[PDB]
UniProtKB/TrEMBL annotation, chain C:
It comes from Acetobacter pasteurianus (Acetobacter turbidans). Disulfide bonds join 72-76. It comes from the Bacteria. Residues 33-218 form the Xaa-Pro dipeptidyl-peptidase C-terminal domain. This is Alpha-amino acid ester hydrolase. The chain holds residues 367 to 584 of 667 of the full protein. The lineage of its organism: Bacteria, Pseudomonadati, Pseudomonadota, Alphaproteobacteria, Acetobacterales.
């Protein structure tokens, strides 16, 4: 028979020079015998080149395949690797223990060796063994490794910084997972983030890829409200069989389980000597606590190594993409590329490429969301609560729903009814966690919708005649009362745009939030020991809000918005003290009257970091 | 140790009622022992339910998972299954031999038992065994199977129709792969379709999924032109090791390899008795030959079974999606849903649901691209070349670049230079085969770009005073000459929109092609035996163009466009006779002068199917 | 299925809604023109138009009613069917014997936006299809009370003028009453994902309470 006409076999070929890179796939063995899938992307003809390392639970093979099996290294590697590709760096992407091509057991954000991990390995040793292997098995390298990564890839950088290998000359954690309870991925001052369920199922269903939780309705506002409590949704989603959720469900408060996982406190106690470059976006919707708190803790512990914090006008992980825009906002050019080319690259070159120019970075490099330019602060912040050059300036809530820098001596209070049957949407309905395009720029959305609701109290200054500059961490000094025995307190610092913006009409009167957060009332006294609130009693709440580097210009207005719900991002506070909010029953959800006091001894205000 | 705090194991669970359907995964054994992966989607608590079966090489598991593991059957199944989900049908998706979850060897468009397949099995027997199993092993079914599918899924229906199982009561092949050489996926009158390389690599790299061919440039016009010939691109892409390409490369002409695969000729010889519903889009960019030719062949062979042809204003497979628009065109509502609800479903209900209303479909149901309504033709076509009620009306090419219905006795000719170094782009640059959104509606794109080129001759009638209705198959009667020894001939029948369309300004003067095709000159005398063309001699070319059911309204113009390249969709004709165009060398590509004769004894015209 | 003056433009869509072809051009060509030709062009075909020709916003087709409406309050073949408001924020066709009430606070300092903020009257593109906008934003507010039936097992056809039979109380001395009849789309619409759960209003109006007894004497 003729093989060119008659086929009795398979048409799939038994077995399957134009590239400027070489891709190597190896299984790097750890100290306990477990091998880790590692992808090494070496530029063609490279000799004595540095190594950019990233440990990830997001598929190493996929991450080093932006454009699957591309002809150029620039195409094959992510956008965020642009400056390093131009620099001739060797790119290394590794699957962390228990994920994708890697062996071993997978533990969500594996705790460092200690009371929560009694084994001989952790993410710190895993990074140590990796670096040690790379410096002895990559002949095209100069034996100098640099570490970076965003999100969970940033978490591995922090973990490696606890006890780094001598060859790790520099590190750059981008929006890392530092404290999932205080203000990162899982909770925000005790308030549970309902988007975690989809993440759990997508990352812990299998070693490799996993699927999303099938939904009943297109709207997650409807979905979570119909389910009732967060725990009820989890049970309905079949999350009760997932070990990580079981642990989270058992630890709703900031106890030993979470305290022993706070990377900012741990890293500060170890005193590392590796130059660091902390980064997070000003509008980081996933890891707002991470970078800033880890950087500050090291500064307070008097770290003996370069410690710089970089904050641009980006969303979570936005530093690796295009930083020209964010929602309807427009910035002065690609701010992400700007940082990557002017700060990131040269800083890494200083320690990874011998003979390179020496860079002397200041305390912090933060973009100004008002001036539209990069600010270099030699000492930052210049103003704060204690141990700073100056204190914070209180912006008092006043009568007639106003805001003033002048202390109102007389008492006053405004009220709003918080009904859990009708929670305030965090962003316009309908919204589903699967809609990434809406989730990413959520923090810059117009707050005019919330302002029109009777369950949201709004305060504003007059149209400004003189600009007000703020640079630092704003502190919410709230004096609130509730008719219930529990409550959530959402405080928003907003920059109201001019009544009319003729060059960009849609921005007229836009209520742009520059900083906002939520505080679960039960943790007023102690984060570790939740307690019931006294009904109708005005209680003192003191909590820090996301950092700012803004200028409220002429024609603008400074605004404060206060509410008690942020659905479906944060689970509803039943407004009645229950041992575990996760297991709240339908009858536990109570309608409550909230009172925000202003003036006198209980003058509610936003402690602003006003600078000259 | 506490398991709710300390995790020494894996966070991935060992083993991972709210739905209105049940999903069954079974490995159906064929007559030779090879098992085929079969997904059966059954509606909750159903009895005596008909089965809609589709055999596919496009991943059965994925096809039956539009919205992966969705809560409703409507969500889980494709859009084109809407009417069958509403009817309570049982959906069955099966992976064909050698693909995805199925075992055995995979042969691209596996030929039927004969000189190209001497084994005991084929796609006919595989479908036979599948139907036989389904009617005995699905207790919720009434033992009646209906078959449908588009593209390659349509190919399996035609294959099943060669010798169907008694339980296969009705069939509906949608844009099937009938003749890959004549005018389907691979060639169009011998002219090779360069998009096949990507399809070869994506479907035959592995049993499951495969990847695309990495490109050097973003524009495929540049990529293919730089490579030179089609065979040269294939070699550079590593396709020389793919058995199916090896056979295609050896059979460029319509020899025994292609003739023995022409499903229209084979099916008509078998004389099936199973009711058929042939379907294809009027603007089917992937399988224009398929349905119409298979349906016509059966009609000529006097088939003793219902044989209806349906052609809507859709692109390839557009019947299973929304038929409201196509590019800039707007039709009277969702034409695809209309057909699915009014024709498709009731026709299937007649043979699959005992007791249902009897439908008496006409010869053809074609949408009118001019009248904007569905035409029901009891007898179709009413006009054609031979054996019809009336003949075709010739639209003669004339002096001063015009078109007329009056035969011009005066001889004339117009010329254009066809330079292979600068081939005419089929659609605006840049274009890459991966850009689906541009590929799908390509057949309805404005032809004004081509008209502006010196290597494209254009003829047009005067602005019409009275409408001209056309219904049938237009035949290109071309009398052309070339200075070279080979050449390609692209003929386009266009409906020029009114000079101004105030209700939709962008359509003013738009050159909408209602039918166009290419003919490789070397096959003028015989499709099986290619021959060189006499240089400078006017030769007679006679070929059929895609079917029409249009009305050139008042204010419009009928236009004919002729060119010799259609890059990068079709490989360039070297314009010099070579034994194999696939292996053309750089020096073979010759610049030629093309002459289109009009009037006298060599009166070039488009034999239009003009109706009253 | 048009907005104000939509009859003179394209009737294919209205906001996110899609209809069966250019419904406006359809009426202009099939009804308008021939009807005018009958009396303006001597010798033209005679057209016999019914009582009403209304597009069906559910069936997606033109309905020709010889006698319309077939059901109403008085002097019709049949009466109207009451869709009672019930306990647990529900709606039932069965008359609920038990007395019940639901409350909502109406604060004029924070009125309910008719459409999403921001809105200016000059924005024609937002004003035109306002009546078909999703009502999910209103439902999420504590100053709006929402009632709904269970997911329908059988279709419910409505053709005529719906009447609001409201029994409402206010703590003030005046009040406005906005009543919206809404068609909640299926929880999921896979062929057009954005329509999932969409609260499409088929009919809505406002009544100024002071004119309850007499429109001329508040």
């Amino acid at each position: 028979h003729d093989p060119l006409s008659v086929q009795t076999g398979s048409d799939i070929p038994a077995s399957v020079q134009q590239r400027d890179y070489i891709k190597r796939e190896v299984m790097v063995p750890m100290r306990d015998g477990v091998k880790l899938y590692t992808v090494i992307v070496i530029p063609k003809n490279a000799r004595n080149a540095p190594i950019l390392l990233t440990r990830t639970p997001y598929n190493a093979k996929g991450r080093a395949n932006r454009v699957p099996n591309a002809l150029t290294m620039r195409e094959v590697l992510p956008q965020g690797d642009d400056v390093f590709v131009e620099g001739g760096y060797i790119r290394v992407f590794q699957d962390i223990r228990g994920k994708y091509g890697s062996q071993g057991d997978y533990v969500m954000t594996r705790p460092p060796h200690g009371p929560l991990n009694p084994t001989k390995t952790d993410e710190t040793t895993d990074a140590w063994d990796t670096v040690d292997w790379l410096v002895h098995n990559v002949p095209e390298s100069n034996g100098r490794v640099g570490m970076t990564g965003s999100s969970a890839e940033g978490f591995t950088v922090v973990m490696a910084l606890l006890d780094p290998h001598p060859a790790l000359k520099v590190a750059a954690p981008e929006s890392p997972m530092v404290d999932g309870w205080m203000g990162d991925d899982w909770f925000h001052y005790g308030a549970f983030r309902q988007g975690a369920f989809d993440y759990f199922v997508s990352q812990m269903t299998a070693r490799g890829g996993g699927n999303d939780i099938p939904r009943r309705d297109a709207d997650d506002y409807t979905n979570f409200l119909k389910a009732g409590s967060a725990g009820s949704f989890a049970t309905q989603a079949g999350l009760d069989q997932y070990p990580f959720w079981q642990r989270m469900h058992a630890h709703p408060a900031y106890d030993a389980f979470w305290q022993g996982q706070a990377l900012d406190k741990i890293l500060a106690q170890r005193k590392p000597t590796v130059p660091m470059l902390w980064e997070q976006g000003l509008w980081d919707q996933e890891d707002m606590w991470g970078a800033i708190h880890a950087w500050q803790a090291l500064k307070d512990a008097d770290v003996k190594a370069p410690n710089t914090l970089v904050m641009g006008p980006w969303r979570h992980s936005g530093v690796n993409y295009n930083g020209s825009t964010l929602g309807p906002l427009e910035f002065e050019g690609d701010t992400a590329h700007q940082y990557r080319r002017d700060v990131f690259r040269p800083f890494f070159d200083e320690y990874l490429k011998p003979g390179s120019a020496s860079v002397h970075l200041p305390d912090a490099i933060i973009y100004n969301t008002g001036d539209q330019k990069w600010d270099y602060y030699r000492s930052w912040p210049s103003v704060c609560e204690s141990n700073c050059t100056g204190g914070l300036t209180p912006l008092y809530l006043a009568d007639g729903h106003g805001l003033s820098f002048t202390h109102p001596a007389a008492d006053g209070a405004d009220s709003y009814v918080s009904d859990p049957a009708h929670p305030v949407p965090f962003i316009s309905r309908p919204f589903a966690f699967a809609q990434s395009s809406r989730w990413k720029p959520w923090l810059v959305q117009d707050q005019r919708e919330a302002e029109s609701r009777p369950d949201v109290v709004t305060y504003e200054t007059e149209v400004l005649d003189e600009p007000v500059r703020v640079s630092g961490v704003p502190v919410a000094d709230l004096f609130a009362a509730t008719s219930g025995t529990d409550s959530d307190w959402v405080v928003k610092l907003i920059d109201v745009q001019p009544a009319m913006t003729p060059d960009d009409p849609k921005m007229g009167g836009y209520e742009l939030p520059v900083s906002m957060d939520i505080f679960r009332g039960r943790y007023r006294k102690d984060f570790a020991k939740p307690e019931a609130l006294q009904p109708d009693a005005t209680l003192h709440y003191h909590f820090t809000l996301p950092a700012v580097n803004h200028v409220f210009a002429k024609g603008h207005r400074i605004m404060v918005q206060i509410q008690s719900s942020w659905f479906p991002l944060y689970d509803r506070n039943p407004q009645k003290f229950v041992p575990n909010i996760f297991d709240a029953k339908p009858a536990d959800y109570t309608v409550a009257t909230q009172s925000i006091h202003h003036g006198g001894k209980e003058a509610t205000s936003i402690l602003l970091p006003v600078v000259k």
